Nucleic acid binder design. Structure first.
Ligand SMILES: Nc1ncnc2c1ncn2[C@@H]1O[C@H](COP(=O)(O)OP(=O)(O)O)[C@@H](O)[C@H]1O
Ligand SMILES: [Mg+2]
Lengths: 754, 788
DNA sequence: AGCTGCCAGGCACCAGTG
DNA sequence: ACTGGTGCTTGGCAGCT
């Protein structure tokens, strides 16, 4: 099997599916890797069925493997960041290609969603911001330079792709980006003086073109993401807030599972992008807010219609790549048919941004009509076999179809004519590839076959014959069908030619429809869930009246206790004592989630929120080394515009070391950084802090003991906690009474010295 | 909805719905000709699970019947997909002859494939046990029983409380768990796989006694040491009924049951098992476990046995001494024995298939190959001076007579299945040879008929062939076919060839097919007859496999003790553990750097150590290695140390630092005795500065002064280093660290006394906390330190 | 060597002949 | 009530290329 070997050497770094009957086949180290990635057997040999190939390609590319398909020669390759087939993608998750590299000056980073054409670059200023961007964008495939120094950033990632340095050269990158966009320079995209970033974008674009071997006319723009434009969140914070993924790895019990009731897959993906990148420009935020208020009375009417638009964005990528299949055009048509209704419903909405979305959404009446006429109501999945183009669209096609129908009409009549003549009630006409059309008589009747019948195939219980009249009309059927099939294919290709000149407008429409989806959904969410519009103030501050945690209030069936928060430059830090038991943690996270939601333009779970500018959110909530590392990161990077949530640091080391660290951290956050800080602690000794320094106050959670249990209440109250509950929980858990009694004595002994 | 009374159904569906009612909650494969077939919701589910088409079966009454199916010869692959997903499937076969049946042929469910009752090699993992279990809860405690259907190993026990019952589920990890409908403590059992809610009657004591005595051929169960154990018997009765119902044959490999008493083994709680990473690491994999290091057995049955031992340390001094002795005596013999032992294979599971009468031709061939190793193993073991080894050598037997039978009965490399024949060797049965020689002159006769008919007709395209649908034929090309003899009777027409039959060839067809069917049926009869001749010897065969498996474990443990530099431990009268130069057996193999060996001295006078030292200093590892050395000593293995003396250990408890921690601490305080080894790892959590520590202090006191267990108490609370002065039986040790200015170095060496200091600030600095913050923390620390 | 379609063997269904 | 045709799952392989 030397034929496999020399073909494997052609792409030695990619799994090679090698076709062999009804299977694709892998050998040597490819078999091993594949066996462990897919739950299939070894023999070294693995095999995957042919009819399920797209399924196994979906799994492999979701796990970061490129795959070459060999049918010999390599005739198809799929890579994880460059797929655009519906079978290979998850409907409600973005799938990005990215490239990274590094200067002595700093980093360059670029991402592309090959379906939507959304192309971004950035130049992260340091290791931490780069790590945060990688986690946020979570690229399915990641191109990096050979000489990349900071390998620890990307080492554990799926879909890594080591690239030569010359692919990151600035002059090549500019020339190529300018060619792609039809520009002389990149000034119009605001990236002309971002060379670190452009280098990454150029390597990425070169790779994307190499995987497709096709123009990418849907990639018409690039945008730079600046640090000051967004609320920075590091990976640990992103994880701890459970924005789109929970701490266990799933999608339930997240902020998105409550807020994302979008109706299109493109709307879902956009909302999730917004949730992970809160914007600091209140001008954008005020517009989003005003749109959410103005769409309130319209969501019931809009959503059912919007649902029918579908994933127009991903459908348009396939038009751009000329891979769109008959049902993609039928879905595009169906979306066009929703537009007059959406336009009519949106006409009376009092909002400049809704009216702007309405314009941008378009109408495309002439494309609607084209597809109504050109394609049948519910076409087949593939165009390969025809039955796609509607009658009345092309006179030549209708004619070939008529001649085919008349020849098949004739043969059906021949069947009845031959049965009648022969008196043979089993006689029939059929068709297959080997014999073309044939007359079949059963075994028991077949000795009465007329003598002109020419025997051609004996079956266990039948005989098949031809006569010249059968072959005559066979040829009428096959040549007519063949002509019609080839004509359907040419008419279908011509639909691409008529649609593609409108691609830029179509992309704008789908982007508008996706944004409408998001904003109509946030509007329904706000109204349904009793949210309020936050206001922005000039200086750091968070003033919340009856705030709630937006996830916990919908998932638990116990009543949610709403709470106030008052943070300002004069009251910058709260020391939170009392039992934790989830209540402290929830009160802290709900603070971050309210800040996050305000800063995506959403209403918030509260009676009232006023909020100042926030640059970064740190959430050290949820080994001692890992707590101290995360604490270090907060102290090194927080500013007076930062929101810091800290959860009982000092646990995991000695009493006096932990108290000493917690006290130092608190002072540094209060007096040097001046962040707005919620500082949950178990140390009663830390409640003396308000007496020793300005801007610091005590609050606490308490418990109610009753019957034979304890109710940990979630009401945040002024002042220090005056009780501990560890021994009460120990008694309820069955620790022997004599042990509890001795612990109570040691406890008073220990506490009475302070 | 159609009213589907009995009379509204066709004869086929009446039969089918009756068999389905026997198995209402599980998939039913209903044999219809070449297809196992499913209907209604079974079809829809099978379609989704097995990725086969959902179709339908027409009805004259009106509602179409959802249908799906698979050809009978592909059943095994589909059974694998189902059982891997925890699904049971009832297999219904055709019993009757359709030619002599008016209506539908007689159909029976002949077996039910379930996750814990599989015995087929393709459905099992080689190196892992696959148990069925049954569990029952009383007002006072639990009954539990386990069966390994592929070996016949049958056990009962009566775990006294919830924590011990949890430990037993973790240890035995049943693939299928039968539980009584009135089970209260559902937290132990829900979200386990293979869960099977059973009616209470299946746990009735008198029925259990009746069925067990019937299975064993006994009047009572006194001789098995379980007559006394009704709680356990109720679970074992449920289990045995399930085993019988699933297999629907006799089960002669299940010849005994044994009670697992608390006193016979070291009971490790759930946390201990998980924290010592015996067979599973903390993140769920098989890597970097104790087994990954100690398991270099060469047979699957040895690999499974060793893992059972690691999980169940034995308290019987004599057994331990015998195992130790065996390991010492076998050390220079491991290289010779291991290649030969490897050739024995998984005789254990082959013998189960023999007992169930499902053993395939390559099972019997591997059985033969195993018998052929026994004389060599006997010769190698004769010279080993050790009574326990000679007792194993004896128990492994020889079976010369059965070896000879398989050598004569079966060919060198038989096919996978017996259904197509070609298994029984020539010379074994003269009638078979006769029938075969008929389908043998065959090949030659057809070539001669061909050349003769070709030369005689003068038609150079003439060929003789066979088709399964149409039979033997003489073929002539279409262009030459008009020239065929008028005598040639047309059989099958093709596009470009005509095929004919003549009386001579038809006669030859009838005798070759008659004789092929005869030879096949005779083969199947003789193959079944091999079972009849093997099975009388099953008891000695099973004891042989068990001896072969134990030899493999012990020979392995000898090789490990040599290669990893282990030593033989000794046992003392009273609780205590004296280790010189002890190591963590796993950590020393994965670390890419020297393991720092450490002492330990526990005795009734020095029974609790408060262990301090910096985070990352080696506190947890030091505790774990103590328990691992104990565990290894108590399976009969040599241990990672220069010297070990160890007293009796009844139990090992572990708590690695809300309601759960507290509850687990109380169970330890309620259940440890003076013979317990207790590992408390940074416990004591409260809501304020001192409540958690206060509790840890009081728990320590209770362990030291009332219970008197041997306790390793690792803590970050320096306040507890004051315990030794207050409390008899308690001492300080610590994990050494050095501070050379900027940084801290972890020496990993255990020293007597408390650390000079705690090192929280230094660990924080190491973690990256800004120097200016560490500076202020040190200032606050000096204030705090001036209090006393 | 690749692609199409008959067949395996049960049983009920269905339409023509009592 | 018979007689003789049809249908239905998936995997094997003859029968064509
Ligand atoms: N005796 C030893 N020799 C070498 N390395 C050790 C030794 N004991 C522990 N270590 C290493 O030190 C690390 C920390 O050990 P650990 O037992 O977790 O300390 P602690 O529980 O005090 O925080 C472990 O990963 C282990 O690899
Ligand atoms: Mg530890």
């Amino acid at each position: 099997m030397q034929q496999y070997l020399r073909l494997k050497a052609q792409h030695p770094e990619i799994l090679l599916f090698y076709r062999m009957g009804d299977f694709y086949t892998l050998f040597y180290d490819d078999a091993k890797r594949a066996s462990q990635l897919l739950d299939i057997s070894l023999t070294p040999m693995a095999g995957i069925p042919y009819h399920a190939v797209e399924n196994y390609l979906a799994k492999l590319v979701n796990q970061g493997e490129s795959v070459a398909i060999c049918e010999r020669k390599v005739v198809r390759i799929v890579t994880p960041g460059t797929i655009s087939d519906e079978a290979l993608l998850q409907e409600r998750q973005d799938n990005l290609l990215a490239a990274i590299w590094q200067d002595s000056k700093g980093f360059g980073y670029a991402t592309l969603d090959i379906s939507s054409g959304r192309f971004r670059l950035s130049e992260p200023a340091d290791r931490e911001t780069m790590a945060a961007e990688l986690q946020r964008t979570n690229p399915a495939e990641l191109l990096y330079a050979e000489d990349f120094a900071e390998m620890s950033l990307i080492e554990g990632r799926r879909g890594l792709r080591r690239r030569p340095l010359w692919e990151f050269e600035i002059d090549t990158a500019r020339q190529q980006l300018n060619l792609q966009f039809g520009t002389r320079d990149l000034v119009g995209f605001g990236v002309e003086n971002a060379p670190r970033g452009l280098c990454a974008a150029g390597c990425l674009l070169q790779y994307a073109k190499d995987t497709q071997r096709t123009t990418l006319p849907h990639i018409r723009s690039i945008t730079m993401e600046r640090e000051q434009d967004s609320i920075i969140m590091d990976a640990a914070t992103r994880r701890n807030l459970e924005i789109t993924q929970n701490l266990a790895g799933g999608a339930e019990n997240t902020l998105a599972s409550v807020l994302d009731c979008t109706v299109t897959p493109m709307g879902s993906r956009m909302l999730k992008r917004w949730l992970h990148m809160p914007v600091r420009d209140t001008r954008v935020l005020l517009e989003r807010q005003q749109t959410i208020g103005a769409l309130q009375d319209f969501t019931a009417g809009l959503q059912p219609v919007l649902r029918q638009v579908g994933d127009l964005e991903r459908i348009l990528a396939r038009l751009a790549l000329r891979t769109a299949r008959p049902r993609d055009l039928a879905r595009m048509r169906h979306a066009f048919q929703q537009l007059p209704e959406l336009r009519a419903q949106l006409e009376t909405v009092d909002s400049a941004p809704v009216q702007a979305l309405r314009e941008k959404m378009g109408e495309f009446a002439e494309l609607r009509d084209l597809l109504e006429r050109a394609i049948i109501d519910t076409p087949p999945v593939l165009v390969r076999d025809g039955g796609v183009i509607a009658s009345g669209y092309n006179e030549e096609l209708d004619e070939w179809r008529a001649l085919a129908d008349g020849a098949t009409d004739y043969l059906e009549r021949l069947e009845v004519r031959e049965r009648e003549r022969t008196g043979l009630d089993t006689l029939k006409v059929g068709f297959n590839a080997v014999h073309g059309y044939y007359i079949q008589i059963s075994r028991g009747q077949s000795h009465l076959a007329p003598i002109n019948y020419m025997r051609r195939q004996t079956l266990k219980n039948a005989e098949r014959y031809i006569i010249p009249e059968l072959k005559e009309y066979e040829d009428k059927v096959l040549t007519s069908k063949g002509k019609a099939l080839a004509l359907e294919k040419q008419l279908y290709e011509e639909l691409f030619d008529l649609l593609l000149p409108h691609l830029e407008a179509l992309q704008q429409s789908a982007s508008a429809l996706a944004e409408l989806d998001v904003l109509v959904n946030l509007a329904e969410r706000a109204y349904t869930l009793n949210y309020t519009c936050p206001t922005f103030i000039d200086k750091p501050g968070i003033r919340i009246t009856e705030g709630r945690h937006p996830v916990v209030e919908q998932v638990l069936n116990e009543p949610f206790i709403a709470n106030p928060l008052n943070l300002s430059p004069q009251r910058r830090m709260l020391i939170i004592t009392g039992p934790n038991m989830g209540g402290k943690s929830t009160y802290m996270r709900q603070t971050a989630l309210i800040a996050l939601m305000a800063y995506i333009g959403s209403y918030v779970p509260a009676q009232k929120v006023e909020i100042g500018p926030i640059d970064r959110i740190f959430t050290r909530v949820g080994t001692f080394m890992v707590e101290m590392t995360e604490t270090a990161n907060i102290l090194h990077n927080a500013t007076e515009y930062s929101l810091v949530l800290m959860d009982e640091i000092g646990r995991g080391t000695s009493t006096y070391d932990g108290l000493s660290l917690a006290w130092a951290c608190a002072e540094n956050l209060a007096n040097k950084i001046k962040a707005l800080t919620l500082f949950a602690t178990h140390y009663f000794e830390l409640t003396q802090l308000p007496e020793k320094m300005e801007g610091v106050a005590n609050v606490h959670l308490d418990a109610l003991e009753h019957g034979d249990t304890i109710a940990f209440m979630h009401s945040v109250q002024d002042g220090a906690a005056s009780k501990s509950y560890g021994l009460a929980v120990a008694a309820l858990a069955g620790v022997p009474k004599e042990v509890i009694k001795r612990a109570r004595q040691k406890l008073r002994e220990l506490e009475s010295i302070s």
